[PDB]
Design a protein around this motif. Structure first.
Motif, PDB file in Angstrom:
ATOM      1  N   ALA A   5      12.748  21.730   9.680  1.00 44.70           N
ATOM      2  CA  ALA A   5      13.474  22.942  10.041  1.00 44.70           C
ATOM      3  C   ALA A   5      14.916  22.525  10.249  1.00 44.70           C
ATOM      4  CB  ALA A   5      12.904  23.544  11.310  1.00 44.70           C
ATOM      5  N   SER A   6      15.867  23.427  10.022  1.00 42.60           N
ATOM      6  CA  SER A   6      17.240  23.181  10.475  1.00 42.60           C
ATOM      7  C   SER A   6      17.976  24.453  10.820  1.00 42.60           C
ATOM      8  CB  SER A   6      18.074  22.446   9.434  1.00 42.60           C
ATOM      9  OG  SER A   6      18.043  23.196   8.237  1.00 42.60           O
ATOM     10  N   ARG A   8      20.694  27.164  10.787  1.00 37.14           N
ATOM     11  CA  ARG A   8      21.518  27.737   9.736  1.00 37.14           C
ATOM     12  C   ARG A   8      22.847  28.072  10.364  1.00 37.14           C
ATOM     13  NH1 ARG A   8      17.223  31.984   6.924  1.00 37.14           N
ATOM     14  NH2 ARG A   8      15.390  30.569   6.959  1.00 37.14           N
ATOM     15  N   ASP A  55      17.701  30.582  15.039  1.00 35.31           N
ATOM     16  CA  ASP A  55      18.126  29.332  14.469  1.00 35.31           C
ATOM     17  C   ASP A  55      19.475  29.444  13.835  1.00 35.31           C
ATOM     18  OD1 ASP A  55      17.389  31.017  12.375  1.00 35.31           O
ATOM     19  OD2 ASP A  55      16.250  29.464  11.291  1.00 35.31           O
ATOM     20  N   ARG A 207      11.388  28.098   2.750  1.00 33.53           N
ATOM     21  CA  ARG A 207      10.542  27.825   3.909  1.00 33.53           C
ATOM     22  C   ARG A 207       9.057  27.990   3.548  1.00 33.53           C
ATOM     23  NH1 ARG A 207       9.424  27.151   9.196  1.00 33.53           N
ATOM     24  NH2 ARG A 207      11.544  26.403   9.669  1.00 33.53           N
TER      25      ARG A 207
HETATM   26 MG   LIG Z   1      14.885  26.594   8.198  1.00 30.75          MG
END
Ligand SMILES: [Mg+2]
Ligand SMILES: C[S@@+](CC[C@H](N)C(=O)[O-])C[C@H]1O[C@@H](n2cnc3c(N)ncnc32)[C@H](O)[C@@H]1O
Ligand SMILES: C[S@@+](CC[C@H](N)C(=O)[O-])C[C@H]1O[C@@H](n2cnc3c(N)ncnc32)[C@H](O)[C@@H]1O
Ligand SMILES: [Mg+2]
Ligand SMILES: [Mg+2]
Ligand SMILES: [Mg+2]
Lengths: 211, 211
Positions: A5-6, A8, A55, A207
């Motif tokens: 995950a990261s 955004r 996120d 994803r």
């Molecule tokens: Mg992501």
């Protein structure tokens, strides 16, 4: 899956957007320097149907008169009482600019919270991008002649989005220098806020195949 | 190439949007019944960077009090003096509702121009969809559990987009009855206006491989 995950993160350079709290809500586009566009970008960066994207971090760097630059940072996981309409967002931005006006130049060196999830700082576009590079981010420049986003692995991203007139030759030179990767979302030139919507959709779909 | 072009047409059912011209521009979301959402849908249906999409027709059917239904039709090729901000669009919608108020019930059976490219009519959602079917359109329902849009040939389209609460069980029954094809744009539930942006992008890209 990769279970990767990261965050955004987006940076929007608002070339002409007003930098005092003396805001005319009845002329967001004219006297406020396309503040309406900035509001739609905030709206599109964060809001889903029955939720806000936790996120996301959105940075806007405003270069309009009389006190530029001002950088406003919105942190999705912390925002309270913001709704998706331009008027509401404009009032939150007014509050942020008011906070900035109350600070001295030393205090402005740091992020200063105005309302939950919204912070202001004296920070220009290049210094902001540098700061993100030093944190380990990859810088991606959303630009209509870039590589088709379909084919690019996106990791630890910071997405750069220009406005109606764009980032400008000066700051493009700079992105070239630091090796920003240019990516295309569309065969047409879109409004900045549409880019964020397209970019979110690309990431939402990856994803599904990959994470 | 196939050299096939077609109008992109959208119908948005605004379940609660106000139907008189007595509009509070300072509370587009609350007292106007999510009029802000309708304005963003209009904005996203039409506006590009340095242009307006001339192949789009957008229909909104408003069901809020005190005079529902009211159908407002926007014709991209004819619109003048509309800009992408919610306030501007809301004022154009106010004008349209004012026009509707000045007409008698017989006159409301037809499209009546309020401002260039904007027309009002007494027309409900189902009768509007029927009218489009009789013209030869294919009806596509943008719904998160539909077929992946990537794999559907789209021809002579009319795209149906629900709002925050949605089209409702009654009108879904009806779309099922007339064999509306459901298509998905995203694994997430999006704002109605984001659908139009995604749908445009899908069509813009196909245009590149196929037309
Ligand atoms: Mg992501
Ligand atoms: S344009 C007016 C606003 C900004 O959105 C981004 N943009 C517009 N069209 C794009 C496209 N087709 N692909 C990627 N980015 C785009 C660019 O960063 C541009 O400076
Ligand atoms: S939702 C709140 C608003 C409307 O946008 C459309 N929509 C939302 N998410 C979608 C998705 N993931 N795919 C296709 N349409 C969607 C549906 O028509 C829905 O009724
Ligand atoms: Mg930082
Ligand atoms: Mg076409
Ligand atoms: Mg018609």
């Amino acid at each position: 899956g990769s279970h990767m995950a990261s965050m955004r993160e987006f940076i929007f350079k608002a070339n002409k957007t007003i930098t005092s709290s003396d805001i005319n809500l009845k002329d967001l586009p004219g006297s406020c320097g396309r503040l309406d566009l900035l509001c739609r970008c905030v709206s599109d960066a964060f809001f889903l149907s029955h939720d806000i994207r936790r996120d996301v971090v959105f940075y806007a760097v405003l270069y309009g008169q009389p006190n530029p630059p001002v950088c406003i940072k919105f942190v999705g996981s912390e925002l309270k009482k913001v709704s998706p309409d331009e008027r509401n967002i404009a009032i939150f931005i007014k509050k942020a600019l008011k906070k900035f006006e109350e600070l001295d130049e030393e205090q402005r060196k740091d992020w200063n919270q105005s309302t939950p999830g919204i912070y202001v700082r004296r920070l220009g576009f290049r210094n902001l991008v540098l700061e993100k590079l030093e944190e380990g981010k990859n810088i991606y420049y959303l630009h209509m002649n870039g590589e088709d986003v379909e084919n690019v692995d996106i990791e630890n991203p910071v997405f750069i989005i220009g406005d109606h007139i764009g980032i400008g030759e000066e700051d493009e030179r700079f992105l070239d220098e630091i090796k920003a990767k240019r990516i295309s979302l569309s065969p047409l030139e879109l409004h900045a806020n549409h880019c964020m919507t397209m970019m979110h959709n690309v990431l939402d779909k990856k994803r599904i195949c990959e994470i």
